[PDB]
Amino acid sequence: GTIDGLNLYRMVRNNPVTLLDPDGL
Amino acid sequence: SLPKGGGAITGMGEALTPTGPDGMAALSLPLPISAGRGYAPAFTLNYNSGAGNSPFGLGWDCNVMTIRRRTHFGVPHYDETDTFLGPEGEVLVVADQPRDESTLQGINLGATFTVTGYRSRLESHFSRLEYWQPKTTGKTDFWLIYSPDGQVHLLGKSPQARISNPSQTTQTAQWLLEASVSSRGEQIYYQYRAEDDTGCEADEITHHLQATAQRYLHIVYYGNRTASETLPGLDGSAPSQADWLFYLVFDYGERSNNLKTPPAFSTTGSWLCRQDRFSRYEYGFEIRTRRLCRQVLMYHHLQALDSKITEHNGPTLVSRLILNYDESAIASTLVFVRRVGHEQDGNVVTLPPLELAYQDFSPRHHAHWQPMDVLANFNAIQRWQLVDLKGEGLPGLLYQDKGAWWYRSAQRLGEIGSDAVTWEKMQPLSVIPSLQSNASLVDINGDGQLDWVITGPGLRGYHSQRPDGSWTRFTPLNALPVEYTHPRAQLADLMGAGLSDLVLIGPKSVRLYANTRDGFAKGKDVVQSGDITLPVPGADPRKLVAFSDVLGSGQAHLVEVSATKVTCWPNLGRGRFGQPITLPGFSQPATEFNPAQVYLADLDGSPTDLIYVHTNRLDIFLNKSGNGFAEPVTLRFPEGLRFDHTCQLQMADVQGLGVASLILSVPHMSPHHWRCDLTNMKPWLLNEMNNNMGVHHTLRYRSSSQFWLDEKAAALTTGQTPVCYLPFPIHTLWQTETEDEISGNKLVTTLRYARGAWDGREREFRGFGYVEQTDSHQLAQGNAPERTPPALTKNWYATGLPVIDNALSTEYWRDDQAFAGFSPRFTTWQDNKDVPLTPEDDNSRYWFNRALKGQLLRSELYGLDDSTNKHVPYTVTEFRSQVRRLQHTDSRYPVLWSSVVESRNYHYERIASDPQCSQNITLSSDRFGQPLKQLSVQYPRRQQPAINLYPDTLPDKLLANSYDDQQRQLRLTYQQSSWHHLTNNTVRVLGLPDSTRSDIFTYGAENVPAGGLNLELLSDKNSLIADDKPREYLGQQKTAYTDGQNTTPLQTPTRQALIAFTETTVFNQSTLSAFNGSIPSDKLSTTLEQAGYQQTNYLFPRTGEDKVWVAHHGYTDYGTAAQFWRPQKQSNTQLTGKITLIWDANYCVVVQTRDAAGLTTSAKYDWRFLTPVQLTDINDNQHLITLDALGRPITLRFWGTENGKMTGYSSPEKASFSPPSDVNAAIELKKPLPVAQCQVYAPESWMPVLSQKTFNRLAEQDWQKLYNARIITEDGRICTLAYRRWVQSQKAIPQLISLLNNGPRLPPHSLTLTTDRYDHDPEQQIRQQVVFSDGFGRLLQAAARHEAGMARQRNEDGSLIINVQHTENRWAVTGRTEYDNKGQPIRTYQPYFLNDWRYVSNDSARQEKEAYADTHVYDPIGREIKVITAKGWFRRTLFTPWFTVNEDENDTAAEVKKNIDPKLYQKTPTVSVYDNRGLIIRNIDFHRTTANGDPDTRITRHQYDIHGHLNQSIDPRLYEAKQTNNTIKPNFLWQYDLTGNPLCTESIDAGRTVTLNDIEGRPLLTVTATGVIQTRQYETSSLPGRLLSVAEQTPEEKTSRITERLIWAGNTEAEKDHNLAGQCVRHYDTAGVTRLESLSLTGTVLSQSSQLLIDTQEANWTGDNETVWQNMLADDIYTTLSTFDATGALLTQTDAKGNIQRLAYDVAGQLNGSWLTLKGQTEQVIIKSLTYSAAGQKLREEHGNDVITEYSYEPETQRLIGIKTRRPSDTKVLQDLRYEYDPVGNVISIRNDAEATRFWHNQKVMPENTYTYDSLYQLISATGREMANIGQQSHQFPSPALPSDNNTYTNYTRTYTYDRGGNLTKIQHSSPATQNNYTTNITVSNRSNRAVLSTLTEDPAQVDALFDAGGHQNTLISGQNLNWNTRGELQQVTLVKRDKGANDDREWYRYSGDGRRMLKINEQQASNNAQTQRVTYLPNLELRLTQNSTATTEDLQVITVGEAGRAQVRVLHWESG
């Protein structure tokens, strides 16, 4: 749900070099 | 159940009691009392600066619930006229009318008693009292108390439990409490102890006859073994020890007081007599107190609690509380408290003692004569008086000049706040004193009450036939027996014809001169009396007769002073005088004695003392508690002085400290007047404390009289005159210095009092009307210079006097927009409704306003900083009080109730224009005080002011963006309640909840009246809560009570008040509308009741409302009264089975719990503390812990069954382990250890411990002197407080100690060990952890030993060496934190490695500069406002009433002048806007890319409804699109039920999901966005209600399909052996079934299996036959079994094909090496060694390929800066990445110092990768390197660069563009060399966030067709369709569709229940090589299978070692192909 902002399709807060997503949650 | 290492023993934490109004100094100490069954005595050791002497010392008290006769008058008459005081100390009034009874609690009494009910006039607890008087004489009387919670207390039936006059047994003064009983049946019986002549010396015995009235608490019985509703001992019999389980014993020196032997319950010892023997003398008879409590012991009945053990000696001591004293003949004071516990082995363990210190009396090092330069003009040296006339607080100069009386009051001298006192100009005093006659009373300025008595020669009735000197003199009347107005008994005959003159000899001592006595002209030196006559004053001219309180009782006793003996006739009230008391110690020559040189004044402030004036000196005599005088203290007069009868010497309190001073007057010398102060600080007050854990307090007192001089001075700076209302000085607490001996931080608090009050009618102290608290912070050297401002709390209390309480509204902080001020509400109680009334007469006004006393009226919090808003308060609060009149039966007093009906709260946040106002109102309360109509009010935000007062460093128009329509709303939360109560003559249970109902009103901001809302506005007819105005339903609640027999709810509960269940509304008609379209109308009621919901009428209903849906919860079954009604069975809801509780024999604890499914939990306890010590769980595994004598876990063991075998930690019978007590030795304990954890406590480490060798260097008598003075305890400890005052006082120490100055001292620490495996030989080793604490119990640090490495070092003095050096013990220190005295962490240090475990002194590494530490700053509220990092950046927070500005490190990066674009991140802080409810409604962000472009406002809006749940949310881009179209659905619209369970989730991205929650909170029916319904099925009502199966059904499907099946393990023994009990053995998920074959002791999966379905079958598990399910599976069975260590870490794992991974662990529990053993092969090494950093991150790693990886971390920030991966075989750097960050942590730089590989022809340099971000921290630009032959980026995977291609790489550069909602919209790729620049576009929808590749469409309004209802993309790319599972899962992908319906190139997958992909199958339909890859995903195993339709082409196995993404190792294994 709304655990990672409101963009349900955004990837790692548009900061791919710094962050990462382990399980897709 | 018990601590697993996360807790410790509660820090004693004896914080000072606030005691706002009275201003005294208080303290609380808890006695070590076991709660037992739950009913225990409530006792506390209470210090109070106003308390006198007690059986515990001066200023101490241990109050017991008593009831006594009123001592306001002289003495009780013991007639009906006297009045009783309650336990609180309030006067009582008759309730109802008396009655005659003779039976009580089913026990025949013996007489016809007349019962009179009694209640207090001012009622707080609403308890009811009864007085039981026997009509027929011969029996005793007693009292009863009916508590509002059903308790009954018996007070004073047995003669041992009452205080009576030994002469007349009928006279009773205090009814001590005898017994008590609870509603359950618990009983408590107290047994007191009368006074004996044991131990006391003969002179005490002979002087004090009839000294048997005093009572001392001795033994307290509770925890009765048999249930009974009767008060124990109601017959008058002695308590039977067999009947009780717990004993609370107060020792007085009878038992042993040593640390070697434990005291026994049955003692034959001797009572001890104190030195400071004293008497009370207030009830008309001597109440001689001669004893002191030396110990408080708790004894447990072990033989009755546990039948397995027998008590030989008797009840066994469990907790010992030692009380040592500072015994002296003047007064005794408590200066030592220590908790002690004796072990079973005879050894004892001890907690650090508590040291207290009081002020001392030294009149030879503090007194020297000083002239009063003030009185230079004062020419009158012979006749004047230093007495306080008006009652200001300090004595003024009373004199007559030129034949006219004058008086000069006291006045401040110089700087305000200085104790210097001077006197003002003389004033007329128009009242002519010579008007009245001799020995008459005159008033002051015509005041109400007669104050003084005058005696003058020129007055009438004067006959002094033998005088030396005489003049008109005044005296205080209070210094005489109150019966002077009309004398009786001895006072009538002693005064006789009259009194000639009354002359003072002290502050309250008066010398008597009898008139010429007519009727007996001889006038002999004695007048007859009943007991050896009485003397006559003045007759014998060599003897002194005076009225002086030398006994310290409170009454003017008669004193006769002779040359060789003192004689005191005590006062007994009503002019009675007791037998003489010879007071020895004083004796002067019989020839030289003169009574004029005798003066009596209290100099120590403890009984009056004696001073004899000589010509050149004076001698003092300290009164030893009314039992004599000590040796004289010679004080030299001023040099060159000869005192004679012409001079004068007056004793008065010029300092106002309560102790007299020496005022000298000499005619011939200059200056004429002198002064000598014997003490500048009042003695015998607690001013210093230390708990020897690192905390040391310091109290400082200041007199209230000096405060009045300051309040008068400040009020003299203005043109007004203040009035004082405190006649006597009160030594109020002034400052409280709190010092931490570890952190050096001080916390000096300052208190300021003003507007003191005193009641002249009731002679009571009301309190101050203003208290000013100020708490400052002073930190040690080397700390940060950011000093936190000292807060300021201005509090106004109602004193009960209308003269002060009316004028207290001026000192307030004014506000033009404030709401209406509060005035008290006076109502009566008529017809069950508060009827307001205006006070009737001045007598009624006095009683009403008096009830308001002690109530806080206004509270303002100020921050005292240099900021511009320093004059503005943070929060402002004020309360309205109500006084309800209850009855008018008595003419003297009416009965009232004081309560706070209205409270108001302000949150200015130092912003006066825009406050946050809130207010709670109580509209009505019942007759017993319970509320009926409460109301919470959230006020609307004020209009935006024309003058912005917010700071100007905020972004652009942010203040204008802070305003929302939700803020401008008036919210009235109106709740109604009903209560049950049992009103009976023998039953009283109050405040029982019956039913509640909450509603909420919603009005516009224009409905607020000008002055605000009050109770009168709301009581009107048109008010906003009238019964006709609309409202919103919030819910309702009702409590059901059972009688214990049947579950049927009754109408009125019983005395036991058992709660059957709790009912809570969940649904109504309006909330149910969220099921339309998802649930029909007919099956809704059927499915709602199927879930368990029930219907019932509205509580407090209105017209047109019916049948809300409720849920009952909290079911409990209770036993019979013979079991104390303890619960037998409990249940959550009606869908789950009950749990059964099996209690012990005594019904104190639960020993066994049979769960719903029959699994049991057995508990074995320790009865010293009644806490579990050995538990048996569901799988019959034994968990065991052992405890110390104090209840602290010391060892941990467990054992049980794994795979059927019996393995575990060796039992205490298999292998016994002696727990070590030393910390250094337990570190040197090696393998093996049979315990899981070994705890070593060392809390007394802060006290120095001398070695036994230096103990031999110090002789016995030298130790005898130190052990005598309590400076050294019996063990090897030194008292910190006793040492410091022993170096200050008696400064020369007779022994040198080498441990005080620095030396080996450490804060309170504790060791913890942990084994990792069992006895059968492992790697083992010991995991050692050392935690450090402070005086407040906060973790200073924690140390953990590692295996080996290099590290800094610690010096032996406590300092840190920055040089790093190799050492054996790594001992990493983490969590290093420095706390102030309030708990807030001000410094946090990064982790590090140092040898040894000893603490590093704070001041050493404070400014070490190399040690990296963060700095925090806090506001007076406790919120963090500034955080300074190690690098120097600081993130900040700005708090406002309506928003909170959060600036990150880049936001404050501009203000660092003291990365790439500091101006870019300027003014971009996250701003969260709050409403009046305190909910986040807006989240404001600022977008900016260039250092010049002004930012974009990113506003995200969240709307909360009136119910308070998150209703709507809309992102910025849809908000912008909505401002042009209000018909756009927001990003999220949630519907909830009344409780808050989300029912409907309406999202434009992921569709609409509807879910029906169960009553236990379980997912019953879930409807997805596509339309599929998911129904879940649970176990029957008689089971834990776990899940059984899950059924799903699409709209296309007609019958459901069971996709998941659950099969839970039984209770059979065969399943306990594999530890399977309570677990799901077989789980039939959609992919396949996972079976649980075995479990470990720690619960980890030993052995499990998995079996997959066939590809041509869907997961549908119909029927209840388990065999048809096994027909759909595959023959391949994948079983993964593994083994674990004791700490739940994986050692070995076996895959499905037989490969094993071995994982060894280090001493720190971190993996230090990995191994891999292929099947049929040898064990080859994967990870050789593994070293880690301080913070636990990986540091260096060497693999089996012999290639080493080096990690580098930023020591300031613990961030990864570099990765070096070199291979030492050829010394070639394969990869050297080096990262660089910005202050937030975004990756901006990635350089590579490694030379490129051989694949790249003619390439040696690797270009740098750099990145830029916007303020929103989205990746804007990136410069990477791409190989030349990549072409355009597509889903197609590129081709590798083979070494023969001579391939090259070229730099590229991408720039990204982002939607305002976060969607990526464009990628501008550009490579300058390869000339292949392309652009990738993403079309985003107009109404959602669904965005696809531009090639699919460029139309926004067409994208929503490319997505399903659930939000899944139905088409990946042109020609590739994606089908999806019923669980939002990617079912199948079609790669290349082939025509004519043929089978195509497709891929499809299969996942488990938790979503993990277990299967992947790809298909190719090529004509040449039709191949189908099949991959099966298993734990650390991949099964890749490629098959042609001809034969099997390839069989591959992939083995994974480690987790993915963290240096995982892959091993490909081929069977074929």
Residue numbers in the entry:
A (entry chain A): 2133 to 2157
B (entry chain A): 13 to 618, 620 to 1471, 1482 to 2040
Sentences from the paper on this structure:
Tc toxins consist of three components: TcA, TcB, and TcC. We therefore chose TcdB2-TccC3 to function as a cocoon scaffold for translocation of other cargo proteins, which are not components of the Tc toxin system.
In case of the wild-type TccC3HVR, the affinity of TcB-TcC to TcA is in the picomolar range, resulting in almost complete holotoxin formation. This was also the case for holotoxins composed of TcA and cocoons containing Cdc42 (20.3 kDa) and TEV (28.1 kDa). TEV protease is not an exceptionally stable protein, as it unfolds at ~ 52 °C38. However, it contains two small β-barrels, which are known to be a notoriously stable fold. Therefore, we believe that these domains are more rigid than the native Tcc3HVR or other translocated cargos such as HVR128-iLOV, which might prevent the protein from being translocated. To prove this, we determined the structure of TcB-TcC-TEV to a resolution of 3.7 Å using X-ray crystallography. The cocoon of TcB-TcC-TEV shows an identical size and shape to the TcB-TcC(WT) cocoon, with a Cα RMSD of 0.552 Å2. However, the electron density inside appears already at a higher sigma level, indicating that the encapsulated TEV is indeed more rigid and ordered than the native TccC3HVR. This is the likely cause for TEV not being translocated. As folded proteins do not fit through the narrow constriction site of the translocation channel, the formation of defined structural elements such as β-barrels in the cocoon probably results in translocation arrest. Therefore, a third prerequisite needs to be fulfilled: the encapsulated cargo must not form any tertiary structures or stably interact with the cocoon. The two abovementioned cargos violate this prerequisite, with TEV containing two highly stable β-barrels, and Cdc42 possessing an amphipathic C-terminus that associates with a hydrophobic binding pocket in the cocoon.
